Design a protein around this ligand. Structure first.
Ligand SMILES: CCCC[C@@]1(C2CCCC2)Cc2cc(OCCCC(=O)O)c(Cl)c(Cl)c2C1=O
Lengths: 306, 306, 306, 306, 306, 306
């Protein structure tokens, strides 16, 4: 609904990034179940579990059918291949859904969605107010507004809940980024084209060690190296937020910059949880606060009462 | 329709969980009919239905074509493989559709949908009522409302039907969870990569026992271990409900907390099935009851009659 | 359109059942054209068209290529396999479309859709009628309603057509259920995994008899055993209907239960085809008849005329 | 748009039939390009281009690779297979699109869509007319209607164009049905499972004659035998139309059955092309003519003029 | 938007033809990337790059594996096959998109879309005009219309731009048709089933010449022969247009046929680019001009001024 | 929303081009993951890593199975094939998304979307203004408009931000085009059908060098040669823009061409960032400026004040 203004500039970049993070999780995923087979050949000559080396030349005959090649692929794809290479597309999906759903969980929990639901309502109407024109430079209906916003100020003034949740979201969408890099940089070298496996199934095929190949290992390094670069730019967004979300100390509002402009001084600072909801709407666009900066002044209420 | 308020906080978490439970039933299902073949090799040397064990090495030749390998796969996939491994994706779909449809069956049965249909109607209007402003702090049209809600109170006051059905839903969406864990934890070890089969078809192939492999056995342990963890968190939701749905004993309402605020005392407790429909809307958000806490007071009716 | 009230409780269960009956006809169908191949091996040793029986063991060599195996599969899938196993998904689709379309054919035939089209119209307005409030406890516009419903009573009072068609639908949606069970229970044992075929093509392959396998035979027994259980529960719905649709003998209406409540006695029973359209709307919810139980009373017409 | 009334009962059945005719053309078509391969084996022993006939038995070795089998399939699928078996799904699509598009071409040609566009307009308003209530039993605005329909009668009264086109549609949607049966019954026996081909490519494979198999030949007989039965029932619809479209001889209208009911006699028969547009709307439902049977009577115009 | 009237009868046929032209470009295209492989066999005996010719018979053994057959297919499909056979589905798509997009480019270029945007606006209102009723047989608001259309006549009267573009479209959608036939008839014989190739890769396979087969060559002759017949019927549409678009010489309008009917003579011919926009709307349906044939007459303006 | 007028003619062509650029990135991409295999044969005779050259002829036998051919394909597709041939479809997608998203980023950044959001609003209303009719040839409500646009002129008059961003977009959507041609023309010759590889895996297969083939190399030259031609035509669009975006020097507006027409001279030039938003709407269509050319004249304000 009408929550576009409620999202600052930095949380607009993030909503697009958290999609393209998902696009390379379904594209890498459909490409990993349809395919991501392994090819595997035995090594006749071997030295310590390593394929050492060996008129016109001719092929080598291992005397193996197709099902023995297809059996050893599954073994050397299940056992001697890192779980990160096989599950990378399913894993970035699980994480980006968290990074995404955490943002919107603050809009679904009814203890907090209700407070947002009517706060943006009274600001959206106050923006369109003929009296704000005169103050910036059948009134009894407009008096009920003054009593509404006076009630809605005294209704939400007991404690912080949305400033608690929205502070949790940027506390937990930074730890994840700090957790992602802990494992996604430490396990990307595990994926690689050339794979050697040794699985002890001599009884079936006749060989010990099998050199193998993972053809999509190169295409997953690209997505992974494109993913984590699509997550530090994400992480740089949320870092400046907490730099901005604690330096300001916005437990209350500061109307001191407009009280000179209106020259009324009958408008006091709002105590808690009415500032913060207002503080980011001014960070979105600074007009919507100065038109709401008049409904709290009793002189303006008096001039409206006339 | 306008039933969002009618769903408490715990039944909001559940509607999302009952989707992702389904997403891993269609994804595991398309991946089980397209594929989930079995590979199978015979074991030349065997000791009690068990593949015991056995210059440069060379392959083993079983002298089998492709159709004999493709025939024994079907046999050892039909007979010597547990039904739970093959039907897991179809089974969680059947169950999550029950877990899902049971929630909404209370909205379709016309004996009960009708009662919900107009109860939320009179609350949605009473929320938007100018007279509630004065009481919280051409009236003949508003008098018809007082007679409507007095009639609608005496119309629904005979017995409990929605409190019967909505009590059935959380009685039967707990037994299922208790039934799921009885079988889904006891049969997940049945699925496994390495499979040995012995099916007595020597007349066709020439061998008795065949070692086999199920490559998706690892991918189904993950979904199953992800599913049941996506069902105890579900089950923890419905457990607190019955803790909450019996401790309160909400056969009637308790207006005693607002009768001090209004200071009217002309508003009596509603007898049965008008409280419970109101009791969870107050559990959703506690405003919608205090604005409906005035239309029952005859002094307020008298002041409205003026 | 506004026909939801026009459908009793039992025909609400049925509309969902007639979908899931279709879901296992398209899922079983896409799975039967994409696949449902047969595997087939010859039997070197045979006794009366039956594969009798026969250091380390070795494979048996039939000296057949892939195209001879692929040719004999088509033969033993076309000739020695029951049509019910191959066409089950296409057959339940054909039947559920009949079971489904018969329900809605009563809404498309213009001789009967027209009568339904305005009957529900005059009831939907009469439900919202201020005069019904006073009777339950610029009138000239409401007089035209009294003349409309008096005309619409004398307009539809000649014979039964919707009571004829809606009686046909539950006469023909019971015979089908009785026809389904006659063949679907008598032919489900025909589908089975192990198949033996004998097709007399020695000239091409060299063998007489071929043991075969149908890997989806187990997955079709499940859908079939799930289907017919999804059709007797359907059939139990329509059985109670005719128990209810003949015991009542609703050729006319019985207003005798409300004539005490209104205490007017100026409202006579409606003769034919105006009761039945009204009789099931009262079976849906019993309010919509008692508000329509006043527009037929000439005293109420007189009090409205004042 | 509002053209539902303009379509009689028989052209309602037809719109559904002309869909399911198409559903078995896309289903038979996707199933014919994805697959509909041919299998082909050579016949070592042959007598006049016919595969005559021929301890434990053993396979026959033709000494052919896979590409020689795959080459001869294309030849014996291109040359020795009837075009009707390969193109049946594309052919019923081409025909059902004609059967379908011909119906709606009468709504697109602007010389005739315009006439339909305002004729249904003046009937749709006249149906909702308070004056029709009194006649069936600020008027100057209603006078303009009388002059509108008098003008719209004299505007469309010169000749027949929609009665020409709609007569063409049922002249050409009967000849096609008569053309379909001429070829679709005479060529269905051409499709059959067992196929023998002889193509003179000894230089490549080494054989003259090849027995073959067409596995979908049985599934196309079913659709074809289901299609033509889905076209004679179609053809039976359009046959009764011309029985009905010529027996009536509806070059003009006959208001003689209502002139007794109104007892005005100031309403004359409409000459041409205003009757036929009205004649089928009465065949849809007979109410819409008797309410339009008053706007042409000058006494009614006079009583409206008062 | 409301541009349906703005399209004559001939440009209505064309919009459907330019779809079915596209339907056989995506159907022929999906069928050409999924498949359209080539089969290729070597010719042991050859005379001048031509496969000349050559108890019970036996197969010929070329001693080739599957990858040598799969390598020579790509070569003889890339080199010795005409580009028209491989790219026909992609080529008719490119052309039909031009034939299609050129029609609608006249609606997107803002220099001309603006002129169309308000011309149809003033005609759509003037069609619904009570004063046209009297002339065909609070007026100050209608005076502004007379001044609007007098202004909109003097606003668009300087030169021809839409008559320039719409003349370009039928100049360039005839040259293409004349270009299509120049190449599509001269290259359809290139596609054919039997293909002989000779590619000089003896070093890999061992043979010089390879007979091949293109199984879809017959299905592309049908679409091509169906396509070009679906483009001359298109081309016959645009030919009559220029016969009609130059014979008339519609640089201005001719109101001489209605000036007798109105008998006013105060309505002069519109100079340029107001006639042509009006000339084709009369060619669509001749009513919309005679109702617009009154707003230009100063006597009608005078009678409206009264 | 209502931003169609805000986009000049050249940025309308571009929005379509930036789609078809994407259509050949998803079509080339689905065709590159589904397929784009490589075929590879060894060369028995070789001279310096080059396959030199070599009764009836017979095939060459390399004594290789299918898995050795399938292993060497992956190697010679991963190592000896240019990254541009494999990643071309993924690369044009990444670039066209930038070319596309950069255009619309100027509409999402809230510091600039807000300014556009109300500028087009006041022009869209002023276009529909009765007073503009008189000037081109309850007014207190129209006075508020004059004060609104006087305020909205003094509100946006401090600096340039949208003229900064929209200047950045055409500075960065020209450098990319200049960067595309730097690499896309220099790397298209890398893709080619015939490929020779040499990868040093003698230990597994037995050969050193393998001739290979890339069958889609011809289909990617076409898309690439079609792509870059679909990007210079794009690049020609943005080049004329900067020719037009600097020659005009539109830091302010020039009302001198209309001040003769109105003959008021009370309308001064707008200083900065109100001209440019207006300058391109006049470049779209020159009407919307002359109707907005009156609300700034105090004589017109005075005549409106009367
Ligand atoms: C005698 C060995 C050399 C010839 C081949 C070689 C040895 C094994 C393969 C090549 C040809 C072939 C083709 C086959 O079918 C291909 C299915 C692939 C698909 O489904 O795409 C099968 Cl089964 C077999 Cl046994 C065989 C052979 O005897």
């Amino acid at each position: 609904p009408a929550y576009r203004i409620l999202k600052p500039w930095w949380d607009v970049f993030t909503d697009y990034i958290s999609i393209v993070m998902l696009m390379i999780a379904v594209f890498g995923g459909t490409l990993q179940v349809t395919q991501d087979k392994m090819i595997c050949l035995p090594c006749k000559w071997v030295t310590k579990d390593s394929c050492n080396d060996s008129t016109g030349p001719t092929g080598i005959k291992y005397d193996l059918d197709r099902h023995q090649y297809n059996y050893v692929d599954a073994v050397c794809y299940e056992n001697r291949l890192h779980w990160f290479a096989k599950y990378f597309p399913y894993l970035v999906l699980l994480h980006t859904l968290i990074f995404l759903a955490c943002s919107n969980f603050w809009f679904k929990f009814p203890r907090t969605s209700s407070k947002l639901e009517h706060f943006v309502s009274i600001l959206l109407k106050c923006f369109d107010s003929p009296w704000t024109t005169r103050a910036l430079s059948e009134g009894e209906q407009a008096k009920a507004l003054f009593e509404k916003v006076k009630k809605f100020r005294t209704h939400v003034e007991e404690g912080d809940i949305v400033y608690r949740l929205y502070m949790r979201q940027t506390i937990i969408k930074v730890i994840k980024f700090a957790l992602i890099i802990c494992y996604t940089v430490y396990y990307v070298h595990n994926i690689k084209f050339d794979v050697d496996c040794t699985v002890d199934i001599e009884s079936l095929t006749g060989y010990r060690t099998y050199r193998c190949a993972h053809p999509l290992a190169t295409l997953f390094k690209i997505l992974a190296s494109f993913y984590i670069s699509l997550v530090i730019f994400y992480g740089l967004i949320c870092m400046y937020t907490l730099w901005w979300m604690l330096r300001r100390s916005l437990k209350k509002y500061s109307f001191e910059s407009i009280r000179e402009e209106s020259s009324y001084s009958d408008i006091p600072d709002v105590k808690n949880d009415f500032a913060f909801m207002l503080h980011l709407i001014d960070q979105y666009d600074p007009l919507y606060s100065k038109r709401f900066a008049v409904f709290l002044s009793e002189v303006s209420e008096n001039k409206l009462r006339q």
